[PDB]
């Protein structure tokens, strides 16, 4: 993608040296915003081949309020194994906070149902937010939420969504964050009979790890290909009723995969 | 200011018509980011005269964990009177959430002390956030937080801060939001022996109320004046020990005040 390759160059040209939590160096810029009109095509990176199946299985896990690695494992998805303990528990991360924010008075708040109720009944709200940054439970979480917070917006039957991402690995982590949330705008939109608007990504500490320089330099050598088209085959009874088989990406012809290694 | 007048023009040229909660019309854009290098001068609007004393008395009230209008009233500040009930209670708004986020297990978390401890002891953290968007207490708040969330960042001894503002009235409310947080970056910085970096403002629903058109058009007629300089006379024992008398703005020569009326 263009907005994305523009950011990569930016972290290289403008980024300061800064360190990882007692680890690797980074080139760090703070605060950046990109916009994706989702009507122009689905924002899956074409400059390295990304695989959507992990993304999908992860989102449907989140919407189930699920926080144990069992679902992912039953479908060979291994992207949260690192964080899990022996029992597969990740603590009260995303899925638990999206579907059951614990109140001090004993309730569990379903932020995803609230959000659909708002988009359906009060589409002009400025409060259509869902949040994962619960300060009360940050000590129990496997890691603190990267995609801390997001907000929905409705103007002219188009639904947009802004995500704030407190920490971003531009190389590995950002193609995945964009495809995951952009998918959710499409599912949300379908459920509310709204057209898709814009995905706006806003980040805090946006970085490139020092040992991904070669791989970035290679990705910047590639001209972006046309964005693919996301088709959803079925209209489920609700947002908690979508299946992996429901989505297909048409016309995705990326350049090859690039791997990027991490220190331990 | 320039970044600001650029936004005003933008909401006028690009904004869609949208409505207020059962009220006035707005010209609405979604998602915008401006940057202020605080080393270049304090970001107080020079195109309409803004008065800093309300701003200051409000910030020091927030840092006391205080949520009742009594402090403000003892100093003639009347900007939260609208929202207060008979007893002067505003509910668990900003001050209560900054200094005593209630956990489900009975604790009250001081996000402002956490943040100083992080800037002092782990300045390279990507988690230096304080948040007012507690989902559990949104039903009790006089209104839901506009300045929902903010994050601190440290690179080269410069402290920066990004604020996310979910809803923005560009004319009335935005000069005040910038001066209030920018002041806090300076106090924070002083407490941690750090230089001031950048204030990055990010907004969600950014708007101009329909009946402020004349007044916007007048503000856009003015060339911006040089930014003033904020001097803090004293170095308190802690962030909860600053006084109104501690600040002075040097060299502020604004154009005249513009009033902007609101419907009820």
XYZ file of C-alpha atoms in Angstrom:
528
model
C 0.000 0.000 0.000
C 0.858 3.745 -0.604
C -0.169 5.380 2.779
C 1.702 2.569 4.495
C 4.949 2.756 2.397
C 4.864 6.526 2.997
C 4.911 5.822 6.801
C 7.758 3.287 6.464
C 9.834 5.872 4.745
C 8.925 8.365 7.413
C 10.073 6.221 10.341
C 13.360 5.736 8.414
C 13.842 9.455 7.566
C 12.498 11.032 10.745
C 12.661 8.295 13.448
C 14.814 8.728 16.576
C 16.768 5.808 18.067
C 14.916 4.520 21.146
C 14.978 1.219 23.043
C 12.621 -1.722 23.557
C 11.727 -2.986 27.075
C 15.153 -4.096 27.987
C 15.826 -5.327 24.427
C 16.167 -4.270 20.772
C 16.583 -0.765 19.320
C 13.912 1.012 17.345
C 13.477 3.995 15.118
C 10.590 5.761 16.741
C 8.244 8.522 15.672
C 5.265 9.570 17.852
C 1.791 10.276 16.546
C 0.778 9.627 12.925
C -2.568 9.280 11.100
C -3.425 7.546 7.791
C -6.844 7.309 6.178
C -8.190 4.447 4.068
C -11.350 4.961 2.085
C -12.672 1.424 2.311
C -14.809 2.002 -0.792
C -11.534 2.046 -2.807
C -10.701 -1.580 -1.954
C -9.766 -3.621 1.113
C -6.476 -2.413 2.734
C -4.482 -5.636 2.645
C -0.769 -4.892 2.017
C 0.309 -5.996 -1.476
C 4.035 -5.293 -0.962
C 4.484 -8.439 1.185
C 1.994 -11.248 1.002
C -0.147 -11.162 4.187
C -2.306 -14.139 5.157
C -5.812 -13.232 6.188
C -6.857 -16.550 7.829
C -5.084 -15.834 11.140
C -6.662 -12.350 11.114
C -10.169 -13.745 10.644
C -9.901 -16.471 13.269
C -8.586 -13.943 15.681
C -11.423 -11.405 15.173
C -14.152 -14.041 15.533
C -12.376 -15.201 18.761
C -12.427 -11.604 20.118
C -16.180 -11.228 19.401
C -16.873 -14.342 21.393
C -15.501 -12.644 24.593
C -13.014 -15.364 24.587
C -9.662 -15.088 26.052
C -8.425 -18.666 26.052
C -6.298 -19.943 23.173
C -8.470 -23.120 22.618
C -10.560 -21.816 19.625
C -7.435 -20.708 17.771
C -5.752 -23.960 18.474
C -8.669 -26.038 17.191
C -8.017 -24.210 13.886
C -4.210 -24.216 13.931
C -3.855 -20.473 14.693
C -0.731 -19.978 16.721
C -0.313 -16.202 17.001
C -1.125 -15.879 20.756
C 0.830 -18.939 21.924
C 3.748 -16.750 22.969
C 1.644 -14.920 25.505
C -0.461 -17.729 26.877
C 0.205 -19.634 30.073
C 0.053 -23.434 30.498
C -3.752 -23.389 30.512
C -3.962 -21.214 27.422
C -5.145 -18.224 29.363
C -4.163 -14.842 28.209
C -5.860 -12.980 31.064
C -8.630 -10.375 30.543
C -7.297 -9.104 27.196
C -9.365 -7.868 24.181
C -12.225 -10.403 23.952
C -13.041 -10.090 27.694
C -12.942 -6.250 27.596
C -14.992 -5.953 24.366
C -17.813 -8.227 25.534
C -17.681 -7.960 29.367
C -16.075 -4.878 30.879
C -16.439 -5.431 34.641
C -17.971 -2.571 36.542
C -17.011 -1.886 40.243
C -20.716 -2.652 41.170
C -20.617 -6.205 39.788
C -21.958 -5.883 36.127
C -20.206 -6.947 32.875
C -20.785 -4.477 30.033
C -21.055 -5.621 26.412
C -19.403 -2.792 24.534
C -19.985 -4.440 21.132
C -23.790 -4.667 21.638
C -23.866 -1.091 22.982
C -22.071 0.072 19.815
C -24.611 -1.708 17.491
C -27.494 -0.339 19.500
C -25.921 3.184 19.034
C -25.267 2.858 15.339
C -28.825 1.605 14.821
C -30.741 3.887 17.120
C -28.522 6.968 17.518
C -26.221 6.973 14.494
C -25.253 10.662 15.068
C -23.662 9.905 18.470
C -20.206 11.194 19.273
C -19.849 8.540 21.977
C -19.704 5.328 19.821
C -16.474 4.039 21.291
C -15.277 0.648 22.409
C -12.346 0.326 24.709
C -9.929 -2.279 25.826
C -7.763 -0.076 28.044
C -9.343 -0.994 31.365
C -6.908 0.432 33.952
C -8.303 -1.821 36.711
C -7.289 -5.057 34.943
C -3.948 -4.111 33.287
C -2.035 -6.099 35.930
C -3.747 -9.362 34.944
C -3.433 -9.041 31.153
C -0.747 -11.044 29.238
C 0.171 -7.692 27.708
C -1.460 -4.315 27.769
C -3.692 -3.616 24.675
C -1.843 -2.215 21.610
C -5.073 -1.347 19.837
C -6.208 0.408 22.953
C -9.312 2.172 21.761
C -11.564 2.793 18.691
C -14.547 4.987 17.715
C -17.317 4.635 15.114
C -18.824 7.533 13.128
C -21.766 7.854 10.718
C -22.177 10.515 8.012
C -24.111 9.983 4.774
C -24.884 6.292 5.386
C -21.137 5.620 5.445
C -19.687 4.162 8.632
C -16.103 5.099 9.493
C -13.925 3.936 12.357
C -10.815 5.497 13.949
C -8.431 3.193 15.836
C -5.832 4.485 18.177
C -2.813 2.208 18.425
C -0.546 3.117 21.348
C 2.419 1.121 20.125
C 3.057 -0.004 16.558
C 5.635 -2.314 14.920
C 5.225 -0.905 11.372
C 6.753 -3.902 9.668
C 5.111 -6.908 11.345
C 2.212 -5.632 13.290
C 0.691 -2.789 11.265
C -0.584 -4.709 8.082
C -2.369 -7.032 10.516
C -3.949 -4.200 12.570
C -5.375 -2.479 9.479
C -6.878 -5.756 8.010
C -8.339 -6.843 11.322
C -10.221 -3.553 12.023
C -11.141 -2.894 8.465
C -12.812 -6.302 8.433
C -14.779 -5.298 11.523
C -16.024 -2.056 9.786
C -17.376 -4.222 6.996
C -19.109 -6.692 9.375
C -20.511 -3.734 11.540
C -21.690 -1.907 8.368
C -23.444 -5.058 7.074
C -25.212 -5.492 10.360
C -26.488 -1.922 10.346
C -27.251 -1.532 6.627
C -24.593 1.137 6.318
C -22.023 1.582 3.518
C -18.356 1.479 4.497
C -16.618 4.759 4.945
C -13.125 5.296 6.099
C -10.729 3.437 8.358
C -8.518 6.049 10.044
C -5.466 4.663 11.836
C -3.857 6.792 14.493
C -0.754 5.664 16.367
C 1.323 6.640 19.290
C 4.821 5.129 19.374
C 5.212 4.069 15.718
C 8.406 2.145 15.039
C 10.663 -0.088 12.949
C 12.848 -2.562 14.863
C 16.498 -2.001 14.081
C 17.013 -5.517 12.728
C 14.207 -5.195 10.130
C 16.099 -2.546 8.093
C 16.986 -4.950 5.221
C 13.420 -6.208 4.927
C 11.980 -2.657 5.031
C 14.396 -1.628 2.270
C 13.220 -4.498 0.207
C 9.508 -3.670 0.784
C 10.136 -0.046 -0.240
C 11.607 -1.380 -3.576
C 8.124 -2.643 -4.588
C 5.405 -0.699 -6.491
C 2.047 -1.343 -4.776
C -0.486 -3.515 -6.585
C -4.288 -2.790 -6.663
C -6.147 -3.359 -3.510
C -8.248 -6.561 -3.405
C -12.027 -6.638 -2.835
C -13.550 -8.202 0.340
C -16.776 -10.114 -0.287
C -18.912 -11.490 2.528
C -21.051 -14.378 1.261
C -23.701 -14.466 3.951
C -25.667 -12.071 6.164
C -25.651 -13.716 9.684
C -28.294 -13.181 12.272
C -25.854 -11.083 14.322
C -22.265 -9.883 14.649
C -21.622 -12.906 16.937
C -22.840 -15.260 14.155
C -20.196 -14.865 11.355
C -18.110 -17.776 10.169
C -14.642 -18.104 8.605
C -16.265 -19.425 5.434
C -18.271 -16.174 5.088
C -15.413 -14.065 3.667
C -13.367 -14.231 0.467
C -10.749 -11.745 -0.870
C -11.015 -11.311 -4.571
C -8.142 -10.081 -6.727
C -5.286 -10.114 -4.269
C -1.998 -10.407 -6.144
C 0.754 -9.423 -3.700
C 4.514 -9.411 -3.997
C 6.113 -12.295 -2.035
C 6.167 -12.766 1.668
C 8.992 -11.196 3.663
C 9.792 -12.695 7.046
C 11.093 -10.467 9.817
C 12.807 -12.142 12.822
C 12.553 -11.020 16.394
C 14.995 -11.169 19.309
C 13.916 -13.079 22.411
C -2.704 30.019 15.359
C -1.816 28.519 11.882
C -2.473 24.720 12.434
C -5.762 25.707 14.032
C -6.941 28.179 11.296
C -6.028 25.474 8.761
C -8.477 23.089 10.572
C -11.231 25.743 10.693
C -10.987 26.142 6.988
C -11.049 22.401 6.589
C -14.279 21.866 8.529
C -15.800 24.622 6.327
C -14.496 23.200 3.002
C -14.814 19.485 3.708
C -17.362 19.156 6.577
C -20.649 17.266 6.099
C -23.906 18.511 7.651
C -24.691 16.407 10.738
C -26.877 16.978 13.803
C -26.329 17.593 17.517
C -28.082 15.454 20.186
C -31.541 16.521 19.350
C -30.388 20.100 18.642
C -28.204 22.289 16.398
C -26.571 21.419 13.060
C -22.857 20.983 12.599
C -20.301 20.726 9.869
C -18.501 17.564 10.786
C -15.243 15.975 9.723
C -13.922 12.796 11.417
C -10.328 12.244 12.443
C -7.684 14.989 12.254
C -4.222 15.486 13.807
C -2.220 18.692 14.439
C 1.211 18.944 16.026
C 2.533 21.776 18.190
C 6.220 21.939 18.944
C 5.965 23.448 22.403
C 9.546 24.726 22.131
C 8.252 27.230 19.516
C 5.984 29.011 22.016
C 2.866 28.246 24.051
C -0.164 27.372 21.821
C -2.637 29.980 23.029
C -4.837 31.180 20.123
C -3.987 34.763 19.110
C -6.867 35.147 16.621
C -9.440 35.563 19.436
C -8.348 36.574 22.887
C -8.542 33.486 25.159
C -8.418 33.847 28.942
C -6.082 31.435 30.647
C -7.292 31.854 34.274
C -10.308 29.540 33.869
C -8.000 26.995 32.189
C -5.528 27.058 35.079
C -8.106 26.815 37.852
C -9.685 23.947 36.057
C -6.451 21.920 35.636
C -5.436 22.351 39.285
C -9.002 21.211 40.238
C -8.605 18.058 38.073
C -5.244 17.176 39.708
C -6.857 17.327 43.102
C -9.195 14.386 42.162
C -11.928 16.790 42.742
C -15.211 16.604 41.114
C -17.276 19.116 43.052
C -17.625 22.679 41.776
C -16.676 24.284 45.187
C -12.964 25.066 44.390
C -13.900 26.772 41.127
C -16.604 28.712 42.810
C -14.325 29.969 45.585
C -12.334 31.540 42.712
C -15.229 32.717 40.539
C -14.750 30.048 37.826
C -18.116 29.242 36.362
C -17.395 26.930 33.422
C -18.844 23.700 34.949
C -21.959 25.268 36.494
C -24.066 24.122 33.554
C -23.361 20.493 34.288
C -23.456 20.473 38.056
C -26.402 19.446 40.189
C -27.737 21.336 43.238
C -24.863 20.093 45.401
C -22.236 21.025 42.842
C -21.516 17.441 41.980
C -20.519 16.603 38.511
C -20.294 12.848 39.097
C -17.081 10.812 38.584
C -15.755 12.960 35.716
C -12.069 13.806 34.948
C -10.585 14.570 38.394
C -12.027 11.355 39.927
C -10.827 9.184 36.993
C -7.328 10.750 36.835
C -6.596 10.340 40.548
C -8.818 7.384 41.601
C -9.923 4.947 38.917
C -11.990 2.373 40.838
C -11.025 -1.215 40.261
C -13.663 -4.057 40.481
C -11.648 -5.464 43.504
C -12.052 -2.304 45.599
C -8.831 -0.209 44.866
C -8.615 3.386 43.519
C -5.760 3.843 41.040
C -3.833 7.117 40.790
C -3.100 7.355 37.093
C -1.223 10.667 37.471
C 1.280 9.221 40.007
C 1.696 6.083 37.867
C 2.537 8.308 34.875
C 5.225 10.279 36.853
C 6.675 7.066 38.195
C 6.874 5.821 34.518
C 8.405 8.958 33.104
C 10.988 8.957 35.902
C 11.831 5.295 36.111
C 10.906 3.878 32.689
C 10.916 6.844 30.314
C 11.025 4.539 27.222
C 7.627 2.973 28.044
C 4.968 2.710 25.377
C 2.301 2.393 28.073
C 2.415 5.939 29.622
C -1.273 6.637 29.225
C -3.895 8.198 31.434
C -7.530 7.614 30.780
C -10.820 9.097 31.704
C -13.032 6.835 29.592
C -14.044 4.419 32.331
C -16.917 2.429 30.768
C -18.170 1.279 34.195
C -18.941 4.827 35.395
C -20.205 6.552 32.197
C -23.798 6.378 33.482
C -22.975 8.500 36.544
C -20.926 11.217 34.814
C -22.482 14.673 34.087
C -21.230 14.111 30.546
C -18.966 11.548 29.005
C -15.281 12.718 28.702
C -14.465 14.744 25.539
C -10.735 14.518 26.143
C -11.118 10.812 26.575
C -7.532 9.666 26.645
C -3.871 10.857 26.420
C -0.366 9.334 26.175
C 3.108 10.591 27.132
C 6.306 9.867 25.166
C 10.013 10.530 25.789
C 12.725 10.827 23.118
C 15.878 12.927 23.505
C 14.938 14.417 26.896
C 11.868 15.958 25.255
C 8.478 14.922 26.603
C 5.578 14.864 24.142
C 1.919 14.123 24.741
C -0.847 13.004 22.345
C -4.461 13.727 23.330
C -7.358 12.052 21.687
C -10.498 14.174 21.721
C -13.601 12.189 20.753
C -15.764 15.218 20.100
C -14.546 18.727 19.331
C -16.277 22.127 18.990
C -13.478 23.789 16.955
C -14.598 27.311 17.705
C -15.279 27.331 21.457
C -13.811 24.215 22.855
C -10.597 23.548 20.925
C -8.412 26.639 21.979
C -9.204 25.647 25.571
C -8.299 21.947 25.094
C -4.900 22.765 23.571
C -3.959 25.318 26.356
C -5.110 23.046 29.147
C -3.053 19.982 28.038
C -0.102 21.934 26.849
C 0.096 23.448 30.324
C 0.116 19.941 31.783
C 3.082 18.912 29.498
C 5.022 21.833 30.915
C 4.175 20.986 34.566
C 4.921 17.185 33.932
C 8.215 18.078 32.160
C 9.284 20.349 35.056
C 8.586 17.611 37.533
C 10.687 15.102 35.620
C 13.528 17.383 34.483
C 12.549 16.873 30.868
C 12.366 19.498 28.090
C 9.006 19.995 26.393
C 8.478 18.271 23.118
C 5.351 18.205 21.108
C 1.656 18.393 21.886
C -0.154 16.297 19.262
C -3.925 16.758 19.150
C -5.993 14.039 17.566
C -9.768 14.303 17.262
C -12.708 12.218 16.355
C -15.871 14.159 15.488
C -14.395 17.619 14.783
C -17.021 20.274 14.133
C -18.226 23.861 13.764
C -21.758 24.601 14.999
C -23.881 26.005 12.212
C -24.604 29.254 14.051
C -20.891 30.098 14.529
C -20.304 30.636 10.772
C -20.080 34.468 11.048
C -17.622 34.301 13.931
C -15.471 31.664 12.167
C -15.376 33.864 9.058
C -14.211 36.720 11.147
C -11.483 34.626 12.872
C -10.219 33.436 9.472
C -9.828 37.164 8.457
C -7.020 37.558 11.049
C -3.260 36.953 10.517
C -1.921 35.000 13.522
C 0.341 36.825 15.963
C 3.481 35.248 17.589
C 2.885 32.661 20.173
C 3.393 33.815 23.790
C 5.888 32.241 26.221
C 4.711 30.333 29.356
C 6.897 30.909 32.413
C 6.450 28.962 35.636
C 7.876 30.934 38.568
C 8.295 28.154 41.091
C 9.261 24.473 41.215
C 6.700 22.846 43.643
C 7.371 19.774 45.665
C 5.017 17.787 43.415
C 2.504 17.971 40.572
C -0.257 18.272 43.232
C 1.518 21.341 44.714
C 1.263 24.018 41.930
C -0.548 27.282 42.473
C -2.365 29.734 40.178
C 0.266 32.351 40.993
C 3.008 30.045 39.621
C 2.341 30.753 35.922
C 2.590 33.870 33.759
C 2.175 34.216 29.947
C 4.644 36.616 28.498
C 4.111 38.394 25.187
C 0.533 37.499 24.416
C -0.957 40.102 22.090
C -4.127 38.582 20.622
C -6.786 39.986 18.345
C -10.035 40.749 20.239
C -12.358 38.302 21.838
C -15.138 36.790 19.739
C -18.164 35.427 21.559
C -20.034 32.467 20.119
C -23.588 31.776 21.412
C -25.099 28.386 21.963
C -28.665 27.089 21.675
C -30.244 25.581 24.785
